[PDB]
Amino acid sequence: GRRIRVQRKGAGSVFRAHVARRLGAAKLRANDFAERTGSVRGVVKAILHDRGRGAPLARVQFPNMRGEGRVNELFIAPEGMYTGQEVFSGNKATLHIGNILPVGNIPEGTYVCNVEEKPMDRGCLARASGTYCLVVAHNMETNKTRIRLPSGQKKLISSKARAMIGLVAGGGRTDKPLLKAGNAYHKYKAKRNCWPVVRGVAMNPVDHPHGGGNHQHIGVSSCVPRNAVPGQKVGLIAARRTGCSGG
Amino acid sequence: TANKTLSRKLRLAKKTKTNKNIPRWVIAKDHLKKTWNYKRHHWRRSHLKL
Amino acid sequence: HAAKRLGRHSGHGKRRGTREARMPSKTLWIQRQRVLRRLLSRYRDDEKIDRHLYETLYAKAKGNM
Amino acid sequence: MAKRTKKVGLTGKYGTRYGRAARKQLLKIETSQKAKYTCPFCAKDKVRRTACGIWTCRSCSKTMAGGAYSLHTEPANAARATIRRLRLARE
Amino acid sequence: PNTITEENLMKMIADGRGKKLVVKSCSKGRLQGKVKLKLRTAKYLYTLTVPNADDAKSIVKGCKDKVEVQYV
Amino acid sequence: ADCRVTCRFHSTYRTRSKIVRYKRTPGNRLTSLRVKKLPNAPHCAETGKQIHGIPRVIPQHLTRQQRKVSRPYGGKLCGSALRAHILESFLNEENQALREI
RNA sequence: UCCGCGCCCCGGAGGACUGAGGGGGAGACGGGUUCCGCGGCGCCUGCAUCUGGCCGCGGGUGACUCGGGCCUAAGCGGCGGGUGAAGACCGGGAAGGGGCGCCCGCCCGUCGAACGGGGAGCCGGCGGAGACUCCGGCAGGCGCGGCCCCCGCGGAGACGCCCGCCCCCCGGCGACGCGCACGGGGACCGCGGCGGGCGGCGCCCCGGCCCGCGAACGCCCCGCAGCCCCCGGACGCCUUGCGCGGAGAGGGGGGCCCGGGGGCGGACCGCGCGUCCCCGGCCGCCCCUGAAAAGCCGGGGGGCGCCGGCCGCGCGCCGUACCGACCGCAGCAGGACUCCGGGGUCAGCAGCCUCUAGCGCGGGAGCGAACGCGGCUCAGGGAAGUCGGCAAGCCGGCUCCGUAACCUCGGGAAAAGGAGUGGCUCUGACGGCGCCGGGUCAGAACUGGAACGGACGCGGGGAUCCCGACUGUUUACUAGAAAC
RNA sequence: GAGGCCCGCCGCGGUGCUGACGCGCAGAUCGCUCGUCGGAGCCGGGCAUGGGGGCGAAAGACUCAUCGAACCGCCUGGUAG
């Protein structure tokens, strides 16, 4: 047989992210003494576009607490933030869109984004266009806060973890049809070599497990076990159920 | 090529300097009889640096 | 080219290009619009025509009146 | 006038291609993307899209984050209200 | 090259600053109103066009014996 | 009858820095003079408007008086921006006193 | 082709061709002396040779301003260490920089681009071979010294004015997409006129042709649009399209930038339509947002003394000939990256002819069989031929009529189908007025073997049925498909 | 003045003639006729990916005239009823 496309992808080499001309790593401002007690004030210098990200980014300039200059942070932009806004990242921060406060401080029912999976992780959950997490409940004895991830799954994260108030901007980007293959090529060129996609039933027996016969058929069931081998997991992995259904 | 390097030019200039026939007096001194250098190269039929 | 000026060699048989290609119907518009906007502007500056009329006439000129 | 009788108003470019469903959807998104929106500061209908999510008011000279195809998205309008109600309630 | 300020600056440069040579190029192509004086300095060659030969003479008067004249 | 010309640059590839302007020389020949890309004048750091008073020449070949505007924060901030900065600073100090009083 | 030593060499005369995406002039790369002059034909020049890219002999590449070098890009290497039997491979967490008293300081690229970024070159000449390099002029850049001088003013403002440096901070320039239009310059082009030089002339000809040059740079003045300032307080101001204005329009006066134009210095006169290149203000576009740094320069705060001017000198290293000569066994209908691009006809950079420039390809003579290849025409019929209209042919430019079913309402559609088209002599339009400058759109007479897109270029059309929605992609060297 | 729109030059492909050639001009060229010609476009330089591996709009295609497993040397004068 031949190594399949999935196997060839993990060595990078042509399938590595097209990261040239990307602004930088969008991350929440680092936790600092002035964040832990009180709030640091930043000004949104610019709202720009990341090459591979649908959501707009934002250059917010905070003062340098450590020294004498000014430090620039790159943040995923909540909708409604504007150039020349004053954004406060702190334990004592007001509940306005853009501000970063610890999740215990954030009240229940609040739309939050760029939430930290664990305190001082500088950003993890709810970072894509339109996506948000909501505060569900706070256990003040366990210092833990339940949040609902955009998937629906409920995660108990430390009350110390920080989040930016608001819903990420770029909302409703996938509503528009791509319409042409060309529009897809332009989107993927800013991302990685994953497009165009050839179906395995199109490929010859060597190239893919679905492979090929006199007629294009999946042969055995597409469902594969979770404990498949690395070149064998190709169809629906560990499917609990398959098929279109109600709900 | 017009934008060559001195180190490529100097190894090429050795070949131009040594693409010479045996001096006639050398044939007479050594009774060589064979008067062809045989290490001589003609640009069109040759591929130096290959 | 002296005959052409008189109008000797410019008939339908001697034309090999579309009327828009021979003379662009866009460059004929720019000229007319400029010529008429120059006339109306001078009249407004001279006080011959009112500011309000100038606007009404300016729109009708833009509307191929 | 009314050069295109049906809703092929901005989708005349696509011609006889892509199917009716795609063209109908594109009518709504395209008309929204090239529309002028009212800047919450200039209060003038001069906001136009620069990129997906980035909108600039030509007079106010202020760039604001927004929905990919509209200056303001319905989910966002609701969130701002929920955050305001919760904020006012906390104080 | 430049045009020297009247014979105001021309004679000031002639007195002290580099004046390696002056050329009284009268009759440039045998033309009238044509006395062009070309001061060579270190920085630039300067030319003052003077209306009359007599006008040129007043500037030639006071030309240093050290300053060298050439005539075309 | 031929005014065709040959490249002045080291290689024929015509890039942004490889553009020529044709003039006729004293000896009746078309010559290719190089066209240097215009450097651009300083733009206000706040806002983005070109700073008035500074020519679009590389700053090194400019002269100190030419490369400066006689104003506080002159080649950095445009006047409207500077007056906003002055006003914002003064007003903040005046509101702080009112908070204390 | 003719004559001249007469060779396919060279010179003159003809007759032509490549035809400005060139058989033209130049570079990148690859070759590496092929370059130049002189001689020569033994090799080679698939015929010849007196020729030559061949052979012998002697020569030939000159840079402060051009490129390398330098910067960073994708990348690649380095790193206390980390692994592996090793060879090697992997890598930030590791007391990682300097003088004197101090001070400041987490941590690598003197890697990587003769197209990206960069401090600065123009003219004229000269040689057998070269030139942005030589030489003659004229300039610009960056530094090193001598000498002298000396630490801000003006404005209502936007600005203006010859001006300091170091540190730390903040910023700018370097620095950026694509497009249809529209504007402005430059070059080119064409038209007159005048001035100079020709050629033809059977008749005409002030009707033909050739030439008429002005660089970088340095001062001064202008420069649309744009962006600002000051008064003031509104339906207006405006574009080709737009756009704009109580967050200040219009109007009035100003400031700035403008790869540009003029004037002088360096050193023939007018006009027009285009073409090409640059540039501008827009407007459109994107689930696409169109590099970075070296370097240079402002600004804030601290320190702290510069600053200039003038006059000398300096600028090291390497590349620099030539290419129909590269790579395919070859002096091979094959490939091979650019740059600059005249005239006529034309919508055209198409086709067809031409100026400039180049130049007659492993040879020539006869003869005019079959047959073959590349074409041409064919009476009457008009696919009866054939697996099948394969091949050929019809059709076609433009203008004005007219145009169906169906349809996802965008299409179909150039549906289908008609009619005209030349040349002359005019007549209106249209901006242009001191009337001057356009070449298109109409309309008209008169013509002519019953012609006119007269060459050239340049859909045959319709009725269905099956697939695959589409534009795309594919088996280099037998399958372009319904496959992907 | 919009379009992975149409006609059409170069370009880039390569349909048909199953034309020429087939001891070639050529180990795939030639002539017409063509597909496309603002785009999932075309083209140069640098760079990345390596052999049971790569890369593949998928043809078992392509990887230096070599691909249903490149090439070079060796094991190897492999073994053969």
TrEMBL record, chain A:
Q: Which Pfam families does UniProt cross-reference here?
A: Ribosomal_L2_C, Ribosomal_L2_N
Residues forming the Large ribosomal subunit protein uL2 C-terminal domain are 95-230
- List this protein's GO terms for biological process: cytoplasmic translation
Answer whether the UniProt record assigns the keyword Phosphoprotein to this protein. Answer: no
What InterPro entries does the entry give? NA-bd_OB-fold, Rib_uL2_dom2, Ribosomal_uL2, Ribosomal_uL2_arc_euk, Ribosomal_uL2_C, Ribosomal_uL2_CS, Ribosomal_uL2_dom3, Ribosomal_uL2_RNA-bd_dom
Keywords of the record, alphabetical order, are: Ribonucleoprotein, Ribosomal protein
Top-rank taxon of the source lineage equals Eukaryota
Q: Does the keyword Membrane apply?
A: no
For the Large ribosomal subunit protein uL2 RNA-binding domain, which residue ranges apply? 10-89
Would you tell me the Gene Ontology cellular component terms?
Answer: cytosolic large ribosomal subunit
The molecular function terms of the Gene Ontology recorded here are: RNA binding; structural constituent of ribosome
Q: What's the family?
A: Belongs to the universal ribosomal protein uL2 family.
This protein is called Ribosomal protein L8
What is the organism of origin for this protein?
A: Giardia intestinalis (strain ATCC 50803 / WB clone C6)
From TrEMBL, chain B:
SUPFAM superfamilies to which the protein is assigned, alphabetical: Ribosomal protein L39e
List UniProt keywords, sorted A-Z.
Ribonucleoprotein, Ribosomal protein
Q: Does the keyword Lipid biosynthesis apply?
A: no
- A Pfam family per the record: Ribosomal_L39
Q: Which GO terms describe its cellular component?
A: cytosolic large ribosomal subunit
* GO MF assignments: structural constituent of ribosome
Please cite one Gene Ontology biological process associated with this protein: translation
Q: Which family does it belong to?
A: Belongs to the eukaryotic ribosomal protein eL39 family.
The molecule here is called Ribosomal protein L39
TrEMBL record, chain C:
- Residues of the region (Disordered) are 1-22
Leader sequence range is none
Report biased composition (Basic residues) as residue ranges: 1-17
By sequence similarity, the record places it as follows: Belongs to the eukaryotic ribosomal protein eL19 family.
What's the protein name? Ribosomal protein L19
The scientific name of the source species is: Giardia intestinalis (strain ATCC 50803 / WB clone C6) (Giardia lamblia)
Range of the intact protein held here: 67 to 131 of 196
UniProtKB/TrEMBL annotation, chain D:
- Please verify whether the record's keywords include rRNA processing: no
Which terms in the GO cellular component ontology are assigned?
Answer: cytosolic ribosome; ribonucleoprotein complex
Q: Which family does it belong to?
A: Belongs to the eukaryotic ribosomal protein eL43 family.
Q: List the disulfide bonds.
A: 39-42, 39-57, 39-60, 42-57, 42-60, 57-60
Q: Which HAMAP family match?
A: Ribosomal_eL43 (MF_00327)
Protein known as: Ribosomal protein L37a
GO annotation, biological process = translation
Q: Known Pfam families for this protein?
A: Ribosomal_L37ae (PF01780)
Has the keyword DNA-binding been applied to this entry?
A: no
Show the GO MF annotations: structural constituent of ribosome
PANTHER family noted in UniProt: 60S RIBOSOMAL PROTEIN L37A, LARGE RIBOSOMAL SUBUNIT PROTEIN EL43
Instruction: Please give the organism.
Output: Giardia intestinalis (strain ATCC 50803 / WB clone C6) (Giardia lamblia)
Keywords assigned: Ribonucleoprotein, Ribosomal protein
